[PDB]
């Protein structure tokens, strides 16, 4: 049920954030300038 985490200071597109996730097939680590949802899920 627990899949990963997101780290940062502001979770909008104005700064960089780290995304660690393990979907059904792959674990993906990315450090990009994401725009995140209020309630992100899978």
């Amino acid at each position: 049920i627990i899949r990963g985490w997101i780290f940062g200071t502001t979770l909008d597109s104005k700064t960089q954030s780290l995304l660690i996730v393990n979907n059904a097939t792959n674990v993906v680590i990315k450090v990009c300038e994401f725009q995140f949802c209020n309630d992100p899920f899978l």
């Binding site: 899949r3 997101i6 780290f7 940062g8 700064t15 780290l18 680590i29 899920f41 899978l42």
Partner: protein
């Protein structure tokens, strides 16, 4: 110092008793600023 160090461990069987020490997993050179985090649930 711009690194993201992770220590993890798994153990077969409300926080339980015992003593188990986590071993190093990875140290990622992301070089960003972190002050918040959130969990992803499926």
């Amino acid at each position: 110092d711009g690194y993201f160090k992770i220590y993890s461990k798994h153990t077969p069987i409300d926080l339980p008793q015992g003593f188990s020490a986590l071993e190093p997993l990875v140290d990622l050179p992301i070089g960003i600023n972190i002050t918040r985090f959130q969990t992803l649930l499926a």
